[PDB]
Symmetry: C3
Subunit: 89 residues, 3 copies
């Protein structure tokens, strides 16, 4: 009935690091997340068949802090974060 | 070679899938992709329905999804996208 | 501190039996990675797709997620055209931001 801007993260990583991730989201004040499982992917590390994708809608001011919190991680582990623009009602 | 369109990401409990797809059909949506067996915290057995739709279906669709999400878990993310041949949509 | 850069993201939806055709196109174009979401269901112009119903799971619909520099979008769609004229499926092109362009281009 009224659309508001927001950001949406797609966070793709190895499932063994999921707790760390969802845990880190919680501390930034993210209010929810949905997780897509049993993925397969091709990367610099060359192949998988696992991996998960965490979808998180978050206010734009949280983007910075989250990317910063995930920095040390992706600099030592496989994975990627895609930042989207979205609207929610 | 690309035209503008909108893409919905509809996250909700699986028991309500038919309610959700009836809304898409009844509204004129020509197609949809369903991602299954999700997990979440968020109020996003969860599924995500991906629907590419002309912008002028967005209002009407959200209108139907409103009373539902006031009484049930879930969310709707609206995205901007481009496609090659909109007629298909 | 962390700068963001513009990029495009494809969602490619098609029958699983054509996965190799699709990924060959990505590899040839110079796409550096992709993520595949499996065992999907869908409604198309003609019929339902329910991979829970498939006998060989490598036959259900899949969605290929590919982050790609904008200048690969044209070429990729060009290859995906004749395919989608003769087969089920669709491509959605998204705008996105990433922290590390070099990982994608
Ligand atoms: N508007 C849409 N939004 C999301 N997914 C779609 C849409 N249209 C088609 N799809 C996906 O593509 C699949 C095949 O669609 P389509 O090519 O129209 O099939 P068919 O050849 O049987 O008409 C669908 O099952 C669905 O997953
Ligand atoms: N360009 C990309 N597009 C989509 N997914 C990607 C991309 N690059 C990496 N990924 C995902 O991230 C995983 C790890 O890649 P890497 O970080 O290179 O090890 C891959 O298996 C993919 O699932």
């Amino acid at each position: 009935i009224k659309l508001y801007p927001l950001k949406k993260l797609e966070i793709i990583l190895e499932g063994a690091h999921k707790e760390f991730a969802t845990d880190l989201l919680d501390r930034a004040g993210v209010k929810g997340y949905t997780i897509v499982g049993n993925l397969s992917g091709k990367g610099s590390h060359g192949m998988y068949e696992a991996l998960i994708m965490i979808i998180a809608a978050v206010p734009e001011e949280l983007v910075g802090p989250l990317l910063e919190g995930f920095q040390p991680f992706f600099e030592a582990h496989s994975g990627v974060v895609f930042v989207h623009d979205i609207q929610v009602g």
